Amino acid sequence: RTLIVTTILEEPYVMYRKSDKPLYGNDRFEGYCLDLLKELSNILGFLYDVKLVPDGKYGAQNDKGEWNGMVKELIDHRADLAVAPLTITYVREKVIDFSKPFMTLGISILYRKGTPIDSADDLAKQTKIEYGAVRDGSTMTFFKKSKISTYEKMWAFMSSRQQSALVKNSDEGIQRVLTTDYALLMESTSIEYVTQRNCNLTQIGGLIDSKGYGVGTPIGSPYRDKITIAILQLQEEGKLHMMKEKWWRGN
Amino acid sequence: RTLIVTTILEEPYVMYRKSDKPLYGNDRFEGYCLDLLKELSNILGFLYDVKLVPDGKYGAQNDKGEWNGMVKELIDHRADLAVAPLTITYVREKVIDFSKPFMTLGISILYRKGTPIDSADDLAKQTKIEYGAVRDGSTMTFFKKSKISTYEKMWAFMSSRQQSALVKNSDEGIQRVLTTDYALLMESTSIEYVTQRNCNLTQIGGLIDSKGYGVGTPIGSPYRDKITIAILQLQEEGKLHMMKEKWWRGN
Numbered sequence: 439r440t441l442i443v444t445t446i447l448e449e450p451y452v453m454y455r456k457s458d459k460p461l462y463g464n465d466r467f468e469g470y471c472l473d474l475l476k477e478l479s480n481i482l483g484f485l486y487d488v489k490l491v492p493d494g495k496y497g498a499q500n501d502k503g504e505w506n507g508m509v510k511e512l513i514d515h516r517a518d519l520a521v522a523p524l525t526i527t528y529v530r531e532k533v534i535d536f537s538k539p540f541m542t543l544g545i546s547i548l549y550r551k552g553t554p555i556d557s558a559d560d561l562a563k564q565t566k567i568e569y570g571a572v573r574d575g576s577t578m579t580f581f582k583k584s585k586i587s588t589y590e591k592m593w594a595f596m597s598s599r600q601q602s603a604l605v606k607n608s609d610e611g612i613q614r615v616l617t618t619d620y621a622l623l624m625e626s627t628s629i630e631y632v633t634q635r636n637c638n639l640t641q642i643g644g645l646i647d648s649k650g651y652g653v654g655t656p657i658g659s660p661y662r663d664k665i666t667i668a669i670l671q672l673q674e675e676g677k678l679h680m681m682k683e684k685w686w687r688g689n
Numbered sequence: 690r691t692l693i694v695t696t697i698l699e700e701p702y703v704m705y706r707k708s709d710k711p712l713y714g715n716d717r718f719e720g721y722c723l724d725l726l727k728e729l730s731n732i733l734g735f736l737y738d739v740k741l742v743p744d745g746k747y748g749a750q751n752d753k754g755e756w757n758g759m760v761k762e763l764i765d766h767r768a769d770l771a772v773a774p775l776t777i778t779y780v781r782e783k784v785i786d787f788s789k790p791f792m793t794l795g796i797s798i799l800y801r802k803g804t805p806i807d808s809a810d811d812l813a814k815q816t817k818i819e820y821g822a823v824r825d826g827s828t829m830t831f832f833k834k835s836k837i838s839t840y841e842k843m844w845a846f847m848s849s850r851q852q853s854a855l856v857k858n859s860d861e862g863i864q865r866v867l868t869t870d871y872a873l874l875m876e877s878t879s880i881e882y883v884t885q886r887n888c889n890l891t892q893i894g895g896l897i898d899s900k901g902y903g904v905g906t907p908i909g910s911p912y913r914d915k916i917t918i919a920i921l922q923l924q925e926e927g928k929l930h931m932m933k934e935k936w937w938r939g940n
């Protein structure tokens with residue numbers, strides 16, 4: 439059995455190689471997730487075929503209970519694995535299985551260096567420095583759903599200043615950080631990636647929530663626990679560290 | 690079926706209540722893990738009976754492949770669950786199953802406030818400020834097994850200065866931090882706990898490795914995936930955050 443692996447274009451996890459060389463199949467791609475998949479394939483001993491998810495979506499449900507994205511590919515048995523920056527969530531665990539996480543992350547703060555600002559609590563109580571999130575993203579939703587008073591206050595500030603505080607996408611948010619007196623609430627993984635590449639930018643404080651990226655499988659897949667095992671071995675032997683360092687490290 | 694839950698005395702996860710009131714069974718105990726277990730019991734709908742692991746050990750193997758501690762309790766079917774600060778590891782996954790993690794942690798640095806020291810790389814290249822770990826602990830072992838050059842250098846410094854750099858236990862390490870020009874490499878969870886209680890102390894840098902605490906079950910237990918589900922719901926509804934804040938927050 440050659441395993442079909444669903445994934446999604448997303449820097450630095452999955453990219454097309456910058457090459458016009460004759461590269462076919464899996465060799466057309468590079469990135470953290472491709473390196474992970476190679477290691478998994480060598481530990482478990484499987485052949486695989488990487489296929490980009492046709493609709494370019496991660497996976498969400500409609501009101502009929504119909505799914506899209508990589509999740510739908512797994513549900514339909516059109517992929518054996520999803521290897522992507524795919525969050526392990528309660529709702530998704532109802533319909534697919536996941537390995538234990540190969541990467542753990544949390545919402546954090548992207549801001550300029552050399553400022554007394556040190557936490558989310560430092561931002562919440564003031565109005566001089568604007569702060570927000572990508573409109574309708576996971577980070578915005580966290581703040582909308584939060585019953586923690588200090589994040590309830592932050593959401594109230596974001597929701598009332600909806601037009602300016604909430605941005606269209608990650609790229610626009612980073613641009614707003616570099617140009618105005620603004621802080622972007624975003625995932626720690628993305629902050630690490632940006633701060634490595636922009637020396638004027640830094641992470642502020644720690645993690646505001648916690649979640650993991652895991653390898654998705656159909657419910658009952660005999661590969662799920664094997665992949666957990668492989669992930670733990672890669673973690674303990676320092677290989678996850680070196681794969682992260684390969685793709686995240688800047689100049 | 691009343692589930693037998695193996696656990697271990699460990700502040701703030703599992704403690705005896707400071708009370709001479711007539712408290713029996715589960716009511717004799719308090720702590721993060723007791724709160725977690727209560728929530729798990731209410732989501733899944735199980736009765737349970739907390740039993741402290743007789744040998745007071747987490748779980749390790751000898752050369753005959755014989756296990757001890759909470760791991761051995763699970764292997765022997767003398768406990769249905771282990772709910773404790775029990776690390777999900779490759780070797781343990783060979784003999785027991787684990788839920789996905791309810792807490793994620795990594796080695797970090799405990800040091801004084803107001804110093805230019807900001808990372809492990811800042812410590813490694815100098816000798817004026819001594820640094821180390823608890824002798825024969827998980828943190829020391831990480832440095833001993835590491836093939837990362839900057840941690841190889843740190844281990845070389847710890848191993849050559851073996852008598853003074855390596856301490857007997859966590860309590861001795863913290864005391865060495867507060868009295869001498871010294872930094873203790875320790876788990877982020879414990880650093881958070883200490884820094885909340887000592888205002889002269891701070892965490893330095895980020896996480897040096899990554900691991901999770903999970904609920905242990907015997908291999909094949911039908912509770913493992915259910916507990917993962919419950920953990921994700923507690924995470925997403927902010928309950929893991931508030932349980933952490935209950936036990937970790939200082940004065």
Ligand SMILES: Cc1cn(C[C@H](N)C(=O)O)c(=O)n(Cc2cc(-c3ccccc3)sc2C(=O)O)c1=O
Pocket residue numbers: 448496497523524525526571572574575576577578606607608624625628
């Ligand atoms: C790599 C990555 C993936 N995902 C998808 C998510 N992990 C999932 O599993 O659905 C994800 O939500 N984020 C965070 C994120 C992305 C966002 C985005 C939305 C539209 C256009 C461009 C970016 S917003 C956002 C966030 O943190 O809120 C990521 O950084």
Ligand SMILES: Cc1cn(C[C@H](N)C(=O)O)c(=O)n(Cc2cc(-c3ccccc3)sc2C(=O)O)c1=O
Pocket residue numbers: 699747748774775776777822823825826827828829857858859875876879
């Ligand atoms: C709460 C906790 C548990 N464990 C056990 C470990 N999680 C396991 O699953 O075996 C664990 O290793 N650590 C870290 C740790 C404890 C240590 C200790 C050893 C002897 C006497 C007193 C303390 S040393 C240490 C470390 O980080 O190296 C913990 O902080």
Ligand SMILES: [Cl-]
Pocket residue numbers: 536537538666787788789917
């Ligand atoms: Cl699992």
